[PDB]
Here is the input.
Amino acid sequence: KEDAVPILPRCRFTGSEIRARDDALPVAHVALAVEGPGWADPDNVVLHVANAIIGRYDRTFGGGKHLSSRLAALAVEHKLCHSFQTFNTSYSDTGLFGFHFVADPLSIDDMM
Amino acid sequence: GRLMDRIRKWYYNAAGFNKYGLMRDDTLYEDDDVKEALKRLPEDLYNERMFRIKRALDLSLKHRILPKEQWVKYEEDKPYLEPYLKEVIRERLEREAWNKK
Amino acid sequence: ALLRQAYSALFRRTSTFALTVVLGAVLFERAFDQGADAIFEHLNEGKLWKHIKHKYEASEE
Amino acid sequence: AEPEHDQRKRMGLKMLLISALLTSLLYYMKRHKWSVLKSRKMAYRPPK
Ligand SMILES: CCCCCCCCO[C@@H]1O[C@H](CO)[C@@H](O)[C@H](O)[C@H]1O
Here is the structure.
């Protein structure tokens, strides 16, 4: 028993949402993700390449409107958000592939 | 004796908004005075009112009500807005009167 | 599993979903009509011209 | 008075079946979509 590594019970993913609303906060945060494959899967390599195409942004990127990331360009052109990031958080048996962004109340919709 | 009180408490239960967890004042039609009154409410009272209402609408879309336990009791119904609303109407009537003179 | 197969083959891609509705309709019509007409005529045996037609159809004068 | 009589009734048969079918189907879809709000749960969490 002492030298056997314990296998953890699997965690069920659920398409769903949780909305914590507080209009008194200056900017809104939104994260959206689908279930990932987990460390061992080779696809994680492709997923990361994918996230690279979309990439990330934040009002201090100098590239501004010329950034190669389409989403980044749009965010700039239309003042869509203060920032956004893609991620591919892995775990043993599962993971989270998604993106998170920070925007002003009135631009959440376009950004999303 | 306690006639008016028997009637009121009766109508109160007959009305039925307490089954949604709403206070009498939560059910007021928001005309001009009521709108001003609401702007004067302290933050906490205002947020509580908001939740009670949001909750009611959700129960309403679900075609459910709260469990009998959670029903607002006649004597525990807090008239949180009546005080403000009366002052707003008092102020308004003053102006109306004064602008006539 | 048909549901999974159906999903993968038909309902996943919007293009195939439309193709399934069209082809689905063409087949549904053909079947549905034949069936309804079938039911209608059974519930009305010997009352329709289709039924009595033979009596005057090349069997008189 | 009404030569359409038989056709009219044959049409009623098809109308009912398609009506029965289409209504059930649309009831499910309406329910499927609303399920999100029907089962929705909320809570009031003030910094109290
Ligand atoms: C709610 C939607 C109801 C649509 C019902 C469509 C059925 C119409 O079906 C009709 O039946 C007649 C009799 O066989 C035929 O003569 C017509 O050509 C046919 O269009």
